[PDB]
Amino acid sequence: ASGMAVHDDCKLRFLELKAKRTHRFIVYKIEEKQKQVVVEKVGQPIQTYEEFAACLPADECRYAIYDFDFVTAENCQKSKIFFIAWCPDIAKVRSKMIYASSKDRFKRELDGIQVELQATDPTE
Ligand SMILES: CCCCCCCCCCCC[N+](C)(C)[O-]
Numbered sequence: 532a533s534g535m536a537v538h539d540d541c542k543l544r545f546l547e548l549k550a551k552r553t554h555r556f557i558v559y560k561i562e563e564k565q566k567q568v569v570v571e572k573v574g575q576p577i578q579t580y581e582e583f584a585a586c587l588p589a590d591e592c593r594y595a596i597y598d599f600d601f602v603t604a605e606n607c608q609k610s611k612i613f614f615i616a617w618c619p620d621i622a623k624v625r626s627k628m629i630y631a632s633s634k635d636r637f638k639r640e641l642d643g644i645q646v647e648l649q650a651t652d653p654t655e
Contacts, residue, residue: 592630
């Protein structure tokens with residue numbers, strides 16, 4: 532009969548990424564038993580796509596923030612903060628609903644998101 536809370540460390544890790552750009556990405560997980568979103572993994576300032584992808588379980592949903600930077604032709608570095616709702620096909624329908632129904636509430640704690648994505652792997 533309890534709602535979905537968000538552990539303080541979630542915003543703190545996000546704040547470091549947004550303010551200091553010290554983390555390439557952050558992977559969040561919902562602990563249903565404790566009914567709270569927690570930090571599962573925090574990446575170094577520079578991480579490959581493979582290292583990030585490795586952090587998204589093929590059998591479970593997650594939320595993630597990815598600081599997607601790119602270099603312009605003028606050799607200028609820019610970045611967009613991506614919010615990602617990872618929803619693999621084999622995850623339990625129940626878990627998918629839990630992540631989906633708590634998505635907006637969690638996002639609300641992460642001011643500064645510029646692009647929102649929902650991702651799945653069709654190579655299940
Ligand atoms: C910043 C780029 C946004 C792309 C996010 C897409 C992440 C997909 C990761 C697939 C995970 C692969 N898997 C299931 C084997 O773990």
